[PDB]
Each structure stands twice: as C-alpha cells, then as structure tokens.
C-alpha cells in the first residue's frame, strides 16, 4: 500500500583540462536503485541496476539512452553558459544537478511532482508544487525562468509528472514487486560497552530492514530519552537492506531499567528490548 516514489538524480560535473563533463543519472523506486546512465562507461547506455529490470525490452533501453544522451549534451551547454554568466574567471570544476520525479499517495494521487535544479550545491530553479510556476534563487535563474515560461516547460513537465511518471511507477512496482513491495522487519538487539567506573554504553541495533524509514528510541521506565542518545544515520547494508543504531550512556548497574523501542512498517506494534547479559 502506502506512498511510493519514482525519482531520478542527475549530476553533471565539468572537468578542466579533461574534455567532456562527467554525466551520471540514477533512478530509484522508493529506496531501491533500479537504473543508471554514466558518460564515463566506454559504451554509455541507460542500463538496469536491479535484476527485475531485465524484463524491459530493447526499445525501452534504446529510447532511454537517447534521452540520456540528449540531456547530457544540454547539461554540457548549460555548464558552459553558467561559467560565462557568473564570471567564474578562474575556471574550475562546477556542478549542475537535477532531481525529478513523482511522489504518489496510497490512493495514487500525485502528492508532489518534482523538477528541480542546483548549481554548485545550491538551489537554482525549481518547479513549484502547483506544477505551474517556478521558484528562482538569483538573477541568473530569473533569466532561465523567463525562457522556461516562454517555452511552456512547466506545462510539458506537468503533463509528464501527472501522466507518464505515475504510469511508469506502477509498471516498475509490478515488475519488481517481489522486492519493492516487501517489508523486511528489523532484527534488533542490545549490546553493552564498558565506559568508566560510573557508567557504560548500551547500544540498540536494528538490522536487515526495508524500507529505510525507522524510529529507535531509548526510554527509562516510560521516560523518553531521545535527546540524550547518540544516533547514527540510517545506512545501507549493501544487500538491499538498511541498518541503524542508537546508544545511551547509563550508570553502571542500572542497565536493566533502560528499554529500546523500535518502530517500523514491519512491526504491528513497537518492539521493546533490554540488555540481555
């Protein structure tokens, strides 16, 4: 059920003295990468990055490669144009990024359509949530905004985001359903780590879970310790699942009073765990 998303993350980087920019495009469905294009491959093609994408036929791969190549040329031109326009007279490597795609609700409505750009890591121009107007960050982006209004780009991307974007998301969810529609519950446990005469560290682990969204919280007999804890970012295990941990420093000899609570799509109710010496 639930929300789903189709997102493409596109990066172009200029490379003084090396010729053409590095151009990389990557597609995700929810938290799972499924395609890529990379200009540095010796035969650059749009290609599958999940075994279930091998079900798409040659026409899909050809069409998508042609679109990737056309975009690659457009980023190259834009990088050259920006460098003129911002008066980057010392030259150097610069970055254009594009994010686009669709978030859909559990009822398949389009929650948000994205078509959005950054230059050297900063917002440049973005299609607003109305899919009609643009947010520009500075005067260069005002200039591109005028051109894009003139060309009707917002209307073109709105038609794609409300139509093809959603239709292809559905299709990919069907093709990859064994993997994309699964939910892998976290396997959790607590470890214990000496620190000093007066205290120790309890670390709560959540391993092997999908999707990535998760909450880990320590408590002391009901009392929420969220703010006293050390919490790492959720991280990929490399096999399609994710990991996370949260630790708390507690007085030597009171370990038993602390409980870790785990919330995840796969857990009908929160898991409660303690140090098990």
């Amino acid at each position: 059920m639930g929300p789903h998303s189709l997102r493409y993350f596109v990066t172009a980087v200029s490379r003084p003295g090396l010729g053409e920019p590095r151009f990389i495009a990557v597609g995700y469905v929810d938290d799972t990468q499924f395609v890529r294009f990379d200009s540095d491959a010796d035969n650059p093609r749009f290609e599958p990055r999940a075994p279930w994408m091998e079900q798409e036929g040659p026409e899909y791969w050809e069409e998508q490669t042609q679109r990737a190549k056309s975009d690659e040329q457009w980023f190259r031109v834009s990088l050259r144009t920006a460098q003129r326009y911002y008066n980057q007279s010392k030259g150097g490597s610069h970055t254009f990024q594009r994010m686009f795609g669709c978030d859909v609700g559990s009822d398949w409505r389009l929650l948000r359509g994205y078509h959005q750009f950054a230059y050297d890591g900063r917002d440049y121009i973005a299609l607003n949530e109305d899919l009609k107007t643009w947010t520009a960050a500075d005067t260069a982006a005002l200039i591109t905004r005028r051109k894009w209004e003139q060309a009707g780009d917002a209307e073109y991307y709105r038609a794609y985001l409300e139509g093809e974007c959603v239709e292809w998301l559905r299709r990919y969810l069907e093709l990859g359903n064994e993997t994309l529609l699964r939910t892998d519950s976290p396997k959790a446990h607590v470890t214990y780590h000496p620190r000093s005469q007066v205290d120790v560290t309890l670390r709560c682990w959540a391993l092997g879970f999908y999707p990535a969204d998760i909450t880990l919280t320590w408590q002391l007999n009901g009392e929420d310790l969220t703010q006293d804890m050390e919490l790492v970012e959720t991280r990929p295990a490399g096999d399609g699942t994710f990991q996370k941990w949260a630790a708390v420093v507690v007085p030597l000899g009171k370990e038993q009073n602390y409980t870790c609570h785990v919330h995840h799509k796969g857990l009908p109710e929160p898991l409660t765990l303690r140090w098990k010496p």
Binding site: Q64, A68, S70, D71, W74, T81, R98, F100, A140, K147
Partner: peptide, 10 residues
C-alpha cells in the same frame, strides 16, 4: 521513465 530537457534554457 526518464524525460529529457532537450533544447531549453540557461
């Protein structure tokens, strides 16, 4: 389905 910005702007 990737879609191209194919001869637009700045």
């Amino acid at each position: 389905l990737y879609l191209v910005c194919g001869e637009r702007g700045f």
